Tab-separated table of N, CA and C and ligand atoms in Angstrom:
chain	number	residue	atom	x	y	z
T	1	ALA	N	-12.872	21.280	11.148
T	1	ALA	CA	-11.403	21.307	10.824
T	1	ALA	C	-10.874	20.030	10.145
T	2	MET	N	-10.637	18.971	10.917
T	2	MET	CA	-10.034	17.768	10.364
T	2	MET	C	-11.097	16.795	9.851
T	3	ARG	N	-10.809	16.151	8.732
T	3	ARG	CA	-11.701	15.127	8.220
T	3	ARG	C	-11.200	13.770	8.668
T	4	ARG	N	-12.100	12.800	8.704
T	4	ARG	CA	-11.754	11.479	9.172
T	4	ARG	C	-10.788	10.781	8.217
T	5	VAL	N	-9.956	9.924	8.789
T	5	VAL	CA	-9.015	9.147	8.005
T	5	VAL	C	-9.731	7.903	7.529
T	6	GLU	N	-9.756	7.701	6.211
T	6	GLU	CA	-10.435	6.534	5.660
T	6	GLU	C	-9.636	5.750	4.637
T	7	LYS	N	-8.406	6.172	4.382
T	7	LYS	CA	-7.566	5.455	3.426
T	7	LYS	C	-6.538	4.633	4.183
T	8	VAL	N	-6.262	3.447	3.663
T	8	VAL	CA	-5.275	2.559	4.268
T	8	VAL	C	-4.418	1.978	3.165
T	9	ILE	N	-3.103	2.039	3.350
T	9	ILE	CA	-2.175	1.356	2.459
T	9	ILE	C	-1.507	0.230	3.228
T	10	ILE	N	-1.479	-0.952	2.625
T	10	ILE	CA	-0.848	-2.100	3.251
T	10	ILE	C	0.411	-2.392	2.461
T	11	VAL	N	1.514	-2.562	3.203
T	11	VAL	CA	2.825	-2.887	2.637
T	11	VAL	C	3.454	-4.057	3.385
T	12	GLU	N	4.549	-4.588	2.835
T	12	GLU	CA	5.187	-5.786	3.384
T	12	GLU	C	6.186	-5.466	4.490
T	13	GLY	N	6.959	-4.404	4.300
T	13	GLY	CA	8.098	-4.156	5.157
T	13	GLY	C	8.126	-2.781	5.764
T	14	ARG	N	8.879	-2.659	6.852
T	14	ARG	CA	8.988	-1.411	7.594
T	14	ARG	C	9.549	-0.300	6.718
T	15	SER	N	10.567	-0.618	5.917
T	15	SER	CA	11.162	0.381	5.029
T	15	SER	C	10.151	0.846	3.977
T	16	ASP	N	9.339	-0.083	3.466
T	16	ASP	CA	8.274	0.281	2.513
T	16	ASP	C	7.338	1.304	3.153
T	17	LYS	N	7.006	1.070	4.419
T	17	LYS	CA	6.074	1.906	5.173
T	17	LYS	C	6.633	3.306	5.363
T	18	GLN	N	7.889	3.379	5.809
T	18	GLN	CA	8.548	4.660	6.038
T	18	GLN	C	8.598	5.477	4.751
T	19	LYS	N	8.884	4.801	3.646
T	19	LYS	CA	8.992	5.437	2.346
T	19	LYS	C	7.666	5.959	1.828
T	20	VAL	N	6.629	5.132	1.943
T	20	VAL	CA	5.299	5.560	1.549
T	20	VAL	C	4.842	6.742	2.397
T	21	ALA	N	5.062	6.647	3.712
T	21	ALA	CA	4.696	7.726	4.628
T	21	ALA	C	5.344	9.046	4.224
T	22	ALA	N	6.588	8.976	3.733
T	22	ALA	CA	7.380	10.158	3.412
T	22	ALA	C	6.784	10.950	2.249
T	23	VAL	N	6.048	10.268	1.380
T	23	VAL	CA	5.551	10.914	0.166
T	23	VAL	C	4.148	11.501	0.338
T	24	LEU	N	3.411	11.018	1.336
T	24	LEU	CA	2.016	11.392	1.483
T	24	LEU	C	1.809	12.783	2.051
T	25	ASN	N	0.781	13.465	1.553
T	25	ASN	CA	0.415	14.774	2.068
T	25	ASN	C	-0.969	14.781	2.705
T	26	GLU	N	-1.484	13.595	2.989
T	26	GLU	CA	-2.712	13.448	3.768
T	26	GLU	C	-2.536	12.293	4.746
T	27	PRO	N	-3.292	12.301	5.862
T	27	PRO	CA	-3.125	11.194	6.805
T	27	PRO	C	-3.670	9.873	6.241
T	28	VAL	N	-2.837	8.838	6.254
T	28	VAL	CA	-3.227	7.535	5.761
T	28	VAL	C	-2.718	6.519	6.765
T	29	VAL	N	-3.538	5.520	7.095
T	29	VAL	CA	-3.046	4.452	7.935
T	29	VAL	C	-2.185	3.519	7.091
T	30	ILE	N	-0.954	3.275	7.535
T	30	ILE	CA	-0.097	2.352	6.788
T	30	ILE	C	0.151	1.145	7.657
T	31	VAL	N	-0.236	-0.014	7.126
T	31	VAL	CA	-0.155	-1.269	7.845
T	31	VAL	C	0.976	-2.041	7.217
T	32	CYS	N	1.901	-2.516	8.037
T	32	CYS	CA	3.008	-3.325	7.574
T	32	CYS	C	2.773	-4.792	7.993
T	33	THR	N	2.925	-5.743	7.071
T	33	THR	CA	2.661	-7.164	7.381
T	33	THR	C	3.888	-7.855	7.987
T	34	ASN	N	5.039	-7.182	7.909
T	34	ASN	CA	6.314	-7.710	8.409
T	34	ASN	C	6.654	-9.048	7.774
T	35	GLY	N	6.489	-9.102	6.458
T	35	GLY	CA	6.685	-10.335	5.700
T	35	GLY	C	5.355	-11.036	5.522
T	36	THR	N	5.312	-12.323	5.848
T	36	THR	CA	4.074	-13.080	5.711
T	36	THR	C	3.061	-12.718	6.797
T	37	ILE	N	1.786	-12.926	6.493
T	37	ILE	CA	0.704	-12.709	7.453
T	37	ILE	C	-0.253	-13.901	7.399
T	38	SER	N	-0.703	-14.377	8.566
T	38	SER	CA	-1.640	-15.501	8.650
T	38	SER	C	-3.009	-15.141	8.089
T	39	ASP	N	-3.750	-16.151	7.628
T	39	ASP	CA	-5.114	-15.937	7.137
T	39	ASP	C	-6.003	-15.342	8.234
T	40	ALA	N	-5.865	-15.850	9.460
T	40	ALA	CA	-6.675	-15.389	10.589
T	40	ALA	C	-6.497	-13.898	10.803
T	41	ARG	N	-5.240	-13.461	10.908
T	41	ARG	CA	-4.948	-12.045	11.097
T	41	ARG	C	-5.491	-11.232	9.932
T	42	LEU	N	-5.373	-11.767	8.716
T	42	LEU	CA	-5.864	-11.051	7.545
T	42	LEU	C	-7.387	-10.895	7.539
T	43	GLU	N	-8.102	-11.965	7.882
T	43	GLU	CA	-9.553	-11.908	8.002
T	43	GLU	C	-9.907	-10.855	9.049
T	44	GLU	N	-9.206	-10.903	10.182
T	44	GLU	CA	-9.358	-9.931	11.267
T	44	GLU	C	-9.086	-8.495	10.808
T	45	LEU	N	-8.015	-8.309	10.043
T	45	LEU	CA	-7.694	-7.010	9.474
T	45	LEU	C	-8.779	-6.548	8.488
T	46	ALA	N	-9.196	-7.436	7.584
T	46	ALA	CA	-10.278	-7.130	6.639
T	46	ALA	C	-11.581	-6.706	7.343
T	47	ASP	N	-11.969	-7.450	8.382
T	47	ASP	CA	-13.118	-7.099	9.213
T	47	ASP	C	-13.010	-5.703	9.829
T	48	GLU	N	-11.838	-5.385	10.373
T	48	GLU	CA	-11.617	-4.100	11.030
T	48	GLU	C	-11.658	-2.959	10.018
T	49	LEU	N	-11.191	-3.230	8.800
T	49	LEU	CA	-11.088	-2.179	7.789
T	49	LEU	C	-12.334	-2.076	6.912
T	50	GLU	N	-13.420	-2.702	7.352
T	50	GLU	CA	-14.685	-2.573	6.659
T	50	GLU	C	-15.039	-1.098	6.584
T	51	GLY	N	-15.285	-0.610	5.373
T	51	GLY	CA	-15.687	0.778	5.192
T	51	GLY	C	-14.526	1.703	4.903
T	52	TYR	N	-13.311	1.174	5.002
T	52	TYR	CA	-12.123	1.937	4.640
T	52	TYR	C	-11.817	1.725	3.174
T	53	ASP	N	-11.030	2.646	2.626
T	53	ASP	CA	-10.620	2.612	1.244
T	53	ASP	C	-9.214	2.039	1.301
T	54	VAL	N	-9.112	0.744	1.007
T	54	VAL	CA	-7.888	-0.020	1.262
T	54	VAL	C	-7.081	-0.361	-0.002
T	55	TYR	N	-5.750	-0.250	0.117
T	55	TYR	CA	-4.829	-0.497	-1.010
T	55	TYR	C	-3.691	-1.381	-0.557
T	56	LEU	N	-3.192	-2.213	-1.474
T	56	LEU	CA	-2.029	-3.061	-1.200
T	56	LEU	C	-0.924	-2.709	-2.174
T	57	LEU	N	0.244	-2.347	-1.650
T	57	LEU	CA	1.384	-1.989	-2.484
T	57	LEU	C	2.530	-2.958	-2.149
T	58	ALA	N	2.774	-3.895	-3.063
T	58	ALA	CA	3.765	-4.966	-2.838
T	58	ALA	C	4.880	-4.922	-3.882
T	59	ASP	N	6.011	-5.544	-3.564
T	59	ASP	CA	7.134	-5.611	-4.503
T	59	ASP	C	6.779	-6.407	-5.747
T	60	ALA	N	7.504	-6.146	-6.844
T	60	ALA	CA	7.492	-7.009	-8.040
T	60	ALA	C	8.448	-8.187	-7.878
T	61	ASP	N	8.108	-9.106	-6.983
T	61	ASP	CA	8.917	-10.297	-6.766
T	61	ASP	C	8.013	-11.396	-6.245
T	62	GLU	N	8.551	-12.603	-6.051
T	62	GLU	CA	7.720	-13.731	-5.619
T	62	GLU	C	7.023	-13.518	-4.275
T	63	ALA	N	7.729	-12.913	-3.322
T	63	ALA	CA	7.164	-12.690	-2.002
T	63	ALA	C	6.039	-11.670	-2.094
T	64	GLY	N	6.236	-10.635	-2.919
T	64	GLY	CA	5.196	-9.608	-3.102
T	64	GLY	C	3.969	-10.228	-3.743
T	65	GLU	N	4.206	-11.079	-4.743
T	65	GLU	CA	3.114	-11.772	-5.414
T	65	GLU	C	2.358	-12.746	-4.504
T	66	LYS	N	3.073	-13.394	-3.591
T	66	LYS	CA	2.448	-14.320	-2.630
T	66	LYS	C	1.473	-13.568	-1.737
T	67	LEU	N	1.884	-12.380	-1.315
T	67	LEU	CA	1.015	-11.503	-0.539
T	67	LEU	C	-0.213	-11.099	-1.337
T	68	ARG	N	-0.015	-10.695	-2.596
T	68	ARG	CA	-1.133	-10.307	-3.455
T	68	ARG	C	-2.126	-11.441	-3.590
T	69	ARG	N	-1.603	-12.656	-3.786
T	69	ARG	CA	-2.461	-13.836	-3.926
T	69	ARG	C	-3.338	-14.018	-2.686
T	70	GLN	N	-2.730	-13.866	-1.515
T	70	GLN	CA	-3.446	-13.996	-0.260
T	70	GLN	C	-4.551	-12.956	-0.138
T	71	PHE	N	-4.244	-11.726	-0.546
T	71	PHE	CA	-5.207	-10.635	-0.465
T	71	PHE	C	-6.361	-10.824	-1.426
T	72	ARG	N	-6.082	-11.322	-2.630
T	72	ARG	CA	-7.146	-11.570	-3.604
T	72	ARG	C	-8.134	-12.607	-3.058
T	73	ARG	N	-7.625	-13.538	-2.248
T	73	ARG	CA	-8.455	-14.579	-1.620
T	73	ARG	C	-9.142	-14.140	-0.328
T	74	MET	N	-8.389	-13.487	0.551
T	74	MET	CA	-8.870	-13.193	1.902
T	74	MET	C	-9.432	-11.780	2.050
T	75	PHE	N	-8.999	-10.880	1.173
T	75	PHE	CA	-9.279	-9.448	1.314
T	75	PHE	C	-9.496	-8.826	-0.082
T	76	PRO	N	-10.543	-9.281	-0.788
T	76	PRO	CA	-10.755	-8.839	-2.165
T	76	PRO	C	-11.125	-7.355	-2.263
T	77	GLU	N	-11.516	-6.746	-1.144
T	77	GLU	CA	-11.806	-5.313	-1.108
T	77	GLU	C	-10.568	-4.456	-1.338
T	78	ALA	N	-9.392	-5.019	-1.085
T	78	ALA	CA	-8.166	-4.240	-1.201
T	78	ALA	C	-7.799	-4.067	-2.660
T	79	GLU	N	-7.494	-2.824	-3.035
T	79	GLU	CA	-7.105	-2.476	-4.390
T	79	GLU	C	-5.593	-2.596	-4.531
T	80	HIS	N	-5.144	-3.223	-5.606
T	80	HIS	CA	-3.713	-3.429	-5.804
T	80	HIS	C	-3.043	-2.326	-6.586
T	81	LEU	N	-1.981	-1.786	-5.986
T	81	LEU	CA	-1.128	-0.778	-6.608
T	81	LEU	C	0.193	-1.402	-6.982
T	82	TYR	N	0.764	-0.936	-8.093
T	82	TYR	CA	1.988	-1.536	-8.628
T	82	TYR	C	3.056	-0.495	-8.911
T	83	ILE	N	4.310	-0.869	-8.658
T	83	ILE	CA	5.437	-0.062	-9.112
T	83	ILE	C	5.951	-0.683	-10.415
T	84	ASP	N	6.790	0.063	-11.117
T	84	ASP	CA	7.373	-0.393	-12.377
T	84	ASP	C	8.289	-1.554	-12.048
T	85	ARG	N	8.161	-2.632	-12.815
T	85	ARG	CA	9.027	-3.796	-12.633
T	85	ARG	C	10.515	-3.483	-12.779
T	86	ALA	N	10.834	-2.400	-13.470
T	86	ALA	CA	12.216	-1.979	-13.644
T	86	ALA	C	12.880	-1.611	-12.323
T	87	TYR	N	12.085	-1.193	-11.330
T	87	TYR	CA	12.590	-0.892	-9.980
T	87	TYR	C	12.494	-2.079	-9.014
T	88	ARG	N	11.588	-3.000	-9.321
T	88	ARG	CA	11.516	-4.315	-8.673
T	88	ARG	C	10.888	-4.239	-7.297
T	89	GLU	N	11.500	-3.469	-6.403
T	89	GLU	CA	10.991	-3.377	-5.029
T	89	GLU	C	10.611	-1.959	-4.648
T	90	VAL	N	9.582	-1.842	-3.820
T	90	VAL	CA	9.147	-0.539	-3.314
T	90	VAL	C	10.347	0.209	-2.720
T	91	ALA	N	11.191	-0.515	-1.990
T	91	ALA	CA	12.386	0.067	-1.378
T	91	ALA	C	13.357	0.677	-2.402
T	92	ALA	N	13.413	0.095	-3.600
T	92	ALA	CA	14.336	0.526	-4.648
T	92	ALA	C	13.731	1.593	-5.569
T	93	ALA	N	12.411	1.766	-5.526
T	93	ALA	CA	11.750	2.751	-6.395
T	93	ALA	C	12.087	4.177	-5.986
T	94	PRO	N	12.355	5.051	-6.965
T	94	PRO	CA	12.598	6.451	-6.605
T	94	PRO	C	11.360	7.049	-5.967
T	95	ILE	N	11.586	7.978	-5.056
T	95	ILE	CA	10.510	8.668	-4.356
T	95	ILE	C	9.481	9.247	-5.339
T	96	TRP	N	9.936	9.837	-6.448
T	96	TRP	CA	9.000	10.436	-7.404
T	96	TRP	C	8.094	9.391	-8.028
T	97	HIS	N	8.625	8.187	-8.231
T	97	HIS	CA	7.853	7.134	-8.896
T	97	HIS	C	6.771	6.643	-7.956
T	98	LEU	N	7.150	6.389	-6.702
T	98	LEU	CA	6.176	6.067	-5.664
T	98	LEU	C	5.070	7.134	-5.590
T	99	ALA	N	5.484	8.396	-5.566
T	99	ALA	CA	4.545	9.493	-5.480
T	99	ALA	C	3.568	9.458	-6.645
T	100	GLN	N	4.055	9.199	-7.861
T	100	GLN	CA	3.154	9.121	-9.035
T	100	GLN	C	2.169	7.946	-8.969
T	101	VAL	N	2.641	6.779	-8.532
T	101	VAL	CA	1.758	5.624	-8.349
T	101	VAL	C	0.611	5.992	-7.414
T	102	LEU	N	0.952	6.640	-6.298
T	102	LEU	CA	-0.045	7.015	-5.308
T	102	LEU	C	-0.945	8.121	-5.846
T	103	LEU	N	-0.333	9.095	-6.511
T	103	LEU	CA	-1.116	10.168	-7.137
T	103	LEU	C	-2.140	9.600	-8.140
T	104	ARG	N	-1.726	8.620	-8.943
T	104	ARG	CA	-2.639	7.993	-9.903
T	104	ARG	C	-3.814	7.295	-9.223
T	105	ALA	N	-3.589	6.860	-7.985
T	105	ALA	CA	-4.622	6.218	-7.182
T	105	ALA	C	-5.397	7.223	-6.323
T	106	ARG	N	-5.214	8.507	-6.622
T	106	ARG	CA	-5.957	9.617	-6.011
T	106	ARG	C	-5.517	9.957	-4.572
T	107	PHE	N	-4.293	9.574	-4.213
T	107	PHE	CA	-3.714	10.078	-2.973
T	107	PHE	C	-3.153	11.473	-3.128
T	108	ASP	N	-3.304	12.259	-2.055
T	108	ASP	CA	-2.609	13.549	-1.937
T	108	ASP	C	-1.144	13.289	-1.648
T	109	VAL	N	-0.277	13.737	-2.551
T	109	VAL	CA	1.168	13.585	-2.364
T	109	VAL	C	1.875	14.926	-2.210
T	110	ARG	N	3.018	14.901	-1.534
T	110	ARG	CA	3.826	16.109	-1.352
T	110	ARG	C	4.443	16.503	-2.691
T	111	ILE	N	4.321	17.780	-3.059
T	111	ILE	CA	4.896	18.291	-4.305
T	111	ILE	C	6.395	18.014	-4.312
T	112	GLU	N	7.003	18.144	-3.135
T	112	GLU	CA	8.437	17.954	-2.947
T	112	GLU	C	8.873	16.544	-3.345
T	113	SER	N	7.968	15.578	-3.224
T	113	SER	CA	8.303	14.184	-3.573
T	113	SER	C	8.436	13.931	-5.074
T	114	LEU	N	7.894	14.840	-5.889
T	114	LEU	CA	8.045	14.788	-7.346
T	114	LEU	C	9.331	15.451	-7.866
T	115	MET	N	9.988	16.245	-7.021
T	115	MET	CA	11.282	16.856	-7.368
T	115	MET	C	12.455	16.253	-6.579
J	1	LIG	MG1	10.814	-8.000	-1.976
């Protein structure tokens, strides 16, 4: 019946998480960093997610970029996903745009999220 969950999306904020969750049509673990995250916790997270298909979806702003920088150093296995700079933040991006970003990265998305 059910297949194992192997995809993980990492986001910065709780609202980002709720929004990403709303668009998905398959089970995905969504990890929220709640702003900044320590190197230790990140190494620990990277270790735990060994063998998972991991993605980082951050805002188009300095704080989002700081997170990306940390991940490129501490967690190079994580694949970076981007929203259009015209929307700036994941929170401000329309649901359909989020859905397309995820769809392009081979996530199952709800058809309803495109309308
Ligand atoms: Mg931001």
